[PDB]
Amino acid sequence: MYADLMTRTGQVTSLEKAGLNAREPSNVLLRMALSSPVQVLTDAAVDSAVNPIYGIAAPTLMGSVPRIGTMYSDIIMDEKYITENYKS
Amino acid sequence: SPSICEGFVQASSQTLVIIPDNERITSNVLTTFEATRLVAVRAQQLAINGSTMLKKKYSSPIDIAKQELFNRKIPLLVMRCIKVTPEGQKIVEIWNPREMGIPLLD
Amino acid sequence: MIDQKIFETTLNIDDPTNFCTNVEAHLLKELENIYVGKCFKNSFILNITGVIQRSPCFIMRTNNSGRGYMHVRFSAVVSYLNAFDLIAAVKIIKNDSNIILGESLLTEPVTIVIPSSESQNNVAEVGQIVPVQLANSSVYYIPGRQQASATGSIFIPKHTFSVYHVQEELTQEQALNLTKLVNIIEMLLESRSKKDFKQICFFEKLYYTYSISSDEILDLKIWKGPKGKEMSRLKPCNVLSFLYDALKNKNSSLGFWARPPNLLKSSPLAYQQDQNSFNATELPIICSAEVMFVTLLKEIINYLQFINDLCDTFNNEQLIKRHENIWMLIEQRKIGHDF
Amino acid sequence: GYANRKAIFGLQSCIVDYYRRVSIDTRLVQQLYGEDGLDARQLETVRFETIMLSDQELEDKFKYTGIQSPLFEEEFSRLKKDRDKYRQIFLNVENFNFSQLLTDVRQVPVNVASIVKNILLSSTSGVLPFDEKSILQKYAMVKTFCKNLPYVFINNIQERLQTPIPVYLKRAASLMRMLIRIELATVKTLNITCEQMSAILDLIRLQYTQSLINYGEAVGILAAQSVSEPLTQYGIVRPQEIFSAKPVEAEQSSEMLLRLKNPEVETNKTYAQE
Amino acid sequence: EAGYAEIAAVQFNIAGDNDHKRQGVMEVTISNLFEGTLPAEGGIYDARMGTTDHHYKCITCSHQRKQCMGHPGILQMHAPVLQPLFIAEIRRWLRVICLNCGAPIVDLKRYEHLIRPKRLIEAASSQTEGKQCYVCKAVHPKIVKDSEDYFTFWADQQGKIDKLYPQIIREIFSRVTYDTVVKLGRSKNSHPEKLVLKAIQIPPISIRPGIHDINNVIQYLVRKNLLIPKDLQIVRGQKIPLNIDRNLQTIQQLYYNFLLDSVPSIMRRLPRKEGRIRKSLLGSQVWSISRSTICGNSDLHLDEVGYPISFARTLQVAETVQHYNINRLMPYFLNGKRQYPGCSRVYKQITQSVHDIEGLKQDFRLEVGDILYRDVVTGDVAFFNRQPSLERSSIGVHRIVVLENPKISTFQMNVSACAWYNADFDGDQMNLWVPWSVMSRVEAELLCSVR
Amino acid sequence: IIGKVAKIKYIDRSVMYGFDEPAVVDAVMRPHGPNDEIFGLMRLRYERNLNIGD
Amino acid sequence: RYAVASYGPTDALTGQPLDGKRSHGGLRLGEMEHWVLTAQGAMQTIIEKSHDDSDGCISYICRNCGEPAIYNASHPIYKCMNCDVQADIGMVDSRRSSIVFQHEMRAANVNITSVLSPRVFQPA
Ligand SMILES: [Mg+2]
Numbered sequence A: 001m002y003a004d005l006m007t008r009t010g011q012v013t014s015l016e017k018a019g020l021n022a023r024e025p026s027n028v029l030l031r032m033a034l035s036s037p038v039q040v041l042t043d044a045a046v047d048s049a050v051n052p053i054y055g056i057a058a059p060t061l062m063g064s065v066p067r068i069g070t071m072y073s074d075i076i077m078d079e080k081y082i083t084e085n086y087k088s
Numbered sequence B: 001s002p003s004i005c006e007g008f009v010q011a012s013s014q015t016l017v018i019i020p021d022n023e024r025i026t027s028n029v030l031t032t033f034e035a036t037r038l039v040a041v042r043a044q045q046l047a048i049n050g051s052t053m054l055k056k057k058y059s060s061p062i063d064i065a066k067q068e069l070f071n072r073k074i075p076l077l078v079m080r081c082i083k084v085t086p087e088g089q090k091i092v093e094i095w096n097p098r099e100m101g102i103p104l105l106d
Numbered sequence C: 001m002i003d004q005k006i007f008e009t010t011l012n013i014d015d016p017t018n019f020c021t022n023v024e025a026h027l028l029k030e031l032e033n034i035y036v037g038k039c040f041k042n043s044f045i046l047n048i049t050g051v052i053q054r055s056p057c058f059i060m061r062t063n064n065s066g067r068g069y070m071h072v073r074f075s076a077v078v079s080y081l082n083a084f085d086l087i088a089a090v091k092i093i094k095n096d097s098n099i100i101l102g103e104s105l106l107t108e109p110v111t112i113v114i115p116s117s118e119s120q121n122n123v124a125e126v127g128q129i130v131p132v133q134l135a136n137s138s139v140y141y142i143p144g145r146q147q148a149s150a151t152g153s154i155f156i157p158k159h160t161f162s163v164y165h166v167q168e169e170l171t172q173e174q175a176l177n178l179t180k181l182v183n184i185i186e187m188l189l190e191s192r193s194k195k196d197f198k199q200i201c202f203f204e205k206l207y208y209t210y211s212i213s214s215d216e217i218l219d220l221k222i223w224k225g226p227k228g229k230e231m232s233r234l235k236p237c238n239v240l241s242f243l244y245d246a247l248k249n250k251n252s253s254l255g256f257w258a259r260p261p262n263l264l265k266s267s268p269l270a271y272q273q274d275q276n277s278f279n280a281t282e283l284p285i286i287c288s289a290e291v292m293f294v295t296l297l298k299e300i301i302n303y304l305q306f307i308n309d310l311c312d313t314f315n316n317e318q319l320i321k322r323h324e325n326i327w328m329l330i331e332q333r334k335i336g337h338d339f
Numbered sequence D: 001g002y003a004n005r006k007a008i009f010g011l012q013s014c015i016v017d018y019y020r021r022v023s024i025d026t027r028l029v030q031q032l033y034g035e036d037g038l039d040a041r042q043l044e045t046v047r048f049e050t051i052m053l054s055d056q057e058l059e060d061k062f063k064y065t066g067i068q069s070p071l072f073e074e075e076f077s078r079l080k081k082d083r084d085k086y087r088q089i090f091l092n093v094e095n096f097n098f099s100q101l102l103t104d105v106r107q108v109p110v111n112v113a114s115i116v117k118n119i120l121l122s123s124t125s126g127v128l129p130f131d132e133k134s135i136l137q138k139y140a141m142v143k144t145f146c147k148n149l150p151y152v153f154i155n156n157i158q159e160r161l162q163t164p165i166p167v168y169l170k171r172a173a174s175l176m177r178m179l180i181r182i183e184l185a186t187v188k189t190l191n192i193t194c195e196q197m198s199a200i201l202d203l204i205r206l207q208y209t210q211s212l213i214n215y216g217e218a219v220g221i222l223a224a225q226s227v228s229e230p231l232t233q234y235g236i237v238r239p240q241e242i243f244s245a246k247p248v249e250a251e252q253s254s255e256m257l258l259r260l261k262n263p264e265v266e267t268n269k270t271y272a273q274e
Numbered sequence E: 001e002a003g004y005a006e007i008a009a010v011q012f013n014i015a016g017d018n019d020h021k022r023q024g025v026m027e028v029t030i031s032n033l034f035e036g037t038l039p040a041e042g043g044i045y046d047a048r049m050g051t052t053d054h055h056y057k058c059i060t061c062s063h064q065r066k067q068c069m070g071h072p073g074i075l076q077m078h079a080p081v082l083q084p085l086f087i088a089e090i091r092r093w094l095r096v097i098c099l100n101c102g103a104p105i106v107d108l109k110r111y112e113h114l115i116r117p118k119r120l121i122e123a124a125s126s127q128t129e130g131k132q133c134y135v136c137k138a139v140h141p142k143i144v145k146d147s148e149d150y151f152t153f154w155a156d157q158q159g160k161i162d163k164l165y166p167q168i169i170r171e172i173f174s175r176v177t178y179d180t181v182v183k184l185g186r187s188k189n190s191h192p193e194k195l196v197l198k199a200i201q202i203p204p205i206s207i208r209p210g211i212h213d214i215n216n217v218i219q220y221l222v223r224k225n226l227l228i229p230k231d232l233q234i235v236r237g238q239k240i241p242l243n244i245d246r247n248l249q250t251i252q253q254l255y256y257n258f259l260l261d262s263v264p265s266i267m268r269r270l271p272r273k274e275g276r277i278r279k280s281l282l283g284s285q286v287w288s289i290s291r292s293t294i295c296g297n298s299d300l301h302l303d304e305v306g307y308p309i310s311f312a313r314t315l316q317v318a319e320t321v322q323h324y325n326i327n328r329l330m331p332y333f334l335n336g337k338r339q340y341p342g343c344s345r346v347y348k349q350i351t352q353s354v355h356d357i358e359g360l361k362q363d364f365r366l367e368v369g370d371i372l373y374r375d376v377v378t379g380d381v382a383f384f385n386r387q388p389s390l391e392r393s394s395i396g397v398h399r400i401v402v403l404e405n406p407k408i409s410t411f412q413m414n415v416s417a418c419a420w421y422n423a424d425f426d427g428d429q430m431n432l433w434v435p436w437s438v439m440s441r442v443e444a445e446l447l448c449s450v451r
Numbered sequence F: 001i002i003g004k005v006a007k008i009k010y011i012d013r014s015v016m017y018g019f020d021e022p023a024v025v026d027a028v029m030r031p032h033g034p035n036d037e038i039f040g041l042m043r044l045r046y047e048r049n050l051n052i053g054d
Numbered sequence G: 001r002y003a004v005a006s007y008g009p010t011d012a013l014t015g016q017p018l019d020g021k022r023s024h025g026g027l028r029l030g031e032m033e034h035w036v037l038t039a040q041g042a043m044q045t046i047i048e049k050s051h052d053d054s055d056g057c058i059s060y061i062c063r064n065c066g067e068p069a070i071y072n073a074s075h076p077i078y079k080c081m082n083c084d085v086q087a088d089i090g091m092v093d094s095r096r097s098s099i100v101f102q103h104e105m106r107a108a109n110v111n112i113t114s115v116l117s118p119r120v121f122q123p124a
């Protein structure tokens, strides 16, 4: 898990703030939560960064829950089974 | 000069593309996460409604939901989202928990 | 005017197991409970025609409520008012120093607030019914309200008319589109024909720009126009007949068109000329025939609707006498035959 | 504690897909989690008893001479091929490591040796009489079971239709195919009946399904937790070199390990000192 | 009427004057704080921007304190100010465009080959002072940043030293076309003209409750704003009286310290371990939790925890009344708060109100759809936590065994369960909370059990 | 345990006993502070045997 | 020893309980405890503790501009300060300290635009 993450770009990146910028640059919310929010926030506003919500830290800073674990798969109601077995 | 809201375009609505049953690639066995979520959703909805097909009588929503899952009577489906195409599609696999393998939930 | 619209919305379902017993019926019921009779997205909803497209019932994911939600794309009958439109009935409720407050009766729920001027607070009183003229983009449909906030002015028929220049032909498919407006004029005509002769005559003489010596204005079957000393050397051209002929490509729509105040605003008659000879105070506008046709059918429909609405409001002579002050107020703005 | 928080933030976006890949929102980090797609709570340590044998020991132990048919020559050839491929791969691993010695012991989802013996003890039969038709059917079921093993990574719909398997999923079933062919060789399954061997195979596939990693698992957080724990019993300058990716000039304990040009001159210490 | 939604992305941008003017709900004019009990309308406590008091509603949304999130207001500045966060962006924008015509002085077709978020930086990095413009033929002066503060710029024209007032900088930047901005690296929404502000935003009161010391800074800034003439206009090279120069600096220094004072500031709230992100957002303070010393009990199973009875009558489990559980929930309701196991509250779904069980009507009944909050009994599941939480067995789910001896205050467990938490019995403390929700209770038992 | 009323008619700035186990009032005194102002001084006492968890 | 229930004193800014036994507030589930619960996949427990038991709120956003909207069912308000006739408001689950965080980003003149998830429709 460590080796494949640090080499996924074809170069060796670190587990510091520099490597996080190299692997996930558009994730402003994750990078703010690590080291220095004001500098990260200032760069994001100037470049007009679009930050998709994925993973752990970005959903959490937006007040939501990560789409992970019991929340990974959607549940929908079985209409063809309820309409045939249940009653109004 | 203008406001950001002017140039903002809301995301265009999508279409739900359902992979046909004989082309599904994911496993026919529920993960422990999916079984747990199925039972939890069903138990809360029994705390709302109370109507079930489970013949035997129980005094808890959780017992009813667990036995509904084990006896293949749970009225829910599992949607597995594979990809979101940037022409605006949502390719999904629909799985029927009443026809799937169930994990060991001791 | 009344037409169709397509809306998209998300519905919260508080009991998914019960809701999914009959999805279509429950969906229609909840749409009707939320949207009927309210303003939403610059319009006013009247009926739910049907549900075009929907999603499955997803279970909510960011809370432990166990509740559902659905995306719905539905078709609705809506009533969007145009700028500078003309309504025939309003009961003034509030008549204060600041504003004049009333509500419409015969069309959809609209509230009209007339800016209280020094010449209007002395005339309009509570209980009266007057014709109103709307203004530009003032009909804002605040979402979540039961009415359209709009400012309007007391309608007195104008003495001016606009001339537009047409340089392009009317093709067959634009006529195919305009068939709907032609048909709307037709159904308005067949509804007006059922009404009494005396009511429509009294209202037409009242709201005609000029004044006539009775029984010389109307030919409901033939629409022959006003028999006033043959004012023009060219006969008025029926718009509906011209459209029916240009369907088969027998006449050209090029040249100058106009609808003078003497020309009857309700009837489908109009004037066409290959040269600009109209006594119009304003410069002719250079454009294509499609906009000419759409605007003229919109004007005819508005005036047919107004005359039908005037007749439908005043079914008795007693109310007419009760509101006659408005009648001679309009009458004194008529232009005599001193020309 | 400080190194734990930087590991957690660098790795927390890695999540298992619906293909058992690991990605960061779309971008692949691993093609298959752990290269075998398994949960670390579902592994057992088992011994592969063919690795260390010679070709005469292997000839005796695993080659069947009861029935003279070409199918039992093909079965033994695979036992040799699996042995040599194992040797070649893990001999190479010794060459790019300082001191990482080859082992015949591997961690596997299923212990097939224990499944077979627990059925030999709980059977109502003893030493079965010879039946070559029985032995020929048992050979074909094990051969067909190994051929369809990678479908444990897809589902039973695609196994029925016999659709093509990706190459990276054929590689993922290599250790289990090897173990199944060793512990279910004809020399070992002589007293097992045909309806008993079906019971054995349906148990191996059930336990293999139960050991796969779940979709949507935060396996980058699991890795950060599992590696920062052994760092407590060690946060010196060397770990910070690896995890910060420092350049060569900043290394403090850089080393090398050189081999001699000939395997006939390695044995002399005086030559090496020269 | 508002349907369920989820946030899929977040976009970051620079706010201009028009954004502030469109988002605002009120304009601050006067400096008076309170007129009576109610806040002074038109001031920085105006209730159109939310309520931090439990007596009056918000004028804007008509909600109480809990459901009102706050709305911003606008202060119209008498003299423009620079944006404190983007001073370096302002500095690096002056070195690449002409101070008289707004066309760029650098070669635009020299940096287009690099990625967009670096070409403007590199272009500004190259020396430009002394160059002459190509369309208006003006020499580009030296831009020198003061060392005495953080925002002022001086324009050095071969010994001619000018102070660049924000009116001058705004006028300079307003002449730059969108083509230069787009092709010089930035996007359309990052136009340099938004870097000068003539209408600032007054943050909603929900962000400054405690009518905090950030309220002092706003009140000073509003007061000294009124001292500037309503129509002061500045030209390049124009002499101004030293009181105005002192006044203008005071306002800009106040706005700078309102945001970046020693990063009371808005932006000092964010960074540290005690900041907004790591304390308030990445962690939580929670209700319905307990803590105590742990001790051994060899009569407990490995997946059981002994729970003191006093704690079991403090923490509750919420049960919704239905036809299948009414007879089982009746004994709890009758016991109330005087016998164990009992209950504390009932939520009535026909009234949407919670009533205590002792201060309760005598004609009260349990109706289907009511929610009863009962006591914790033997067999309930509970989360057991020991800190620091280093591995994923640091939180596990145990079956509760209630200890009915009233003299015991410890959390008790089997000694063979201590390996999950790396614990022992010389004074360690562990946390324990009992799931009350049905969804949280299902996944505690199926997912998080210690097996 | 200590009653206190503040003239504004009045607001109740009293003091509760916010502890899990009951106490007993041992001593109540009303001395004079550094600014010669009257301040309440309460002593609460507890009976402590050895118990499980000590 | 300490134990608390579902109500008590609350912080004025973040909306969360106060700090610990001394102030009669709640206890802390920190950053390290959320890592453990996410490693387990226990997401319905994170909702119960960090939202239902800490400071969960409901946020209203306009589809068309991505800006916070004003919604009130009783005494009905349905408005957007940016569009005001095209207001399409959706309710998102948030928590109060996150909304406070976004107002603080806007006070420093950084505009936050929330893109809502698109609607999905079954074909025809
Ligand atoms: Mg200890």
Ligand SMILES: [Zn+2]
Pocket (backbone or CB within 6 Å): E049, E050, E051, E058, E059, E060, E061, E062, E063, E068, E069, E070, E071
């Ligand atoms: Zn408010």
Ligand SMILES: [Zn+2]
Pocket (backbone or CB within 6 Å): G062, G063, G064, G065, G066, G067, G080, G082, G083, G084, G086, G087, G088
């Ligand atoms: Zn909007």
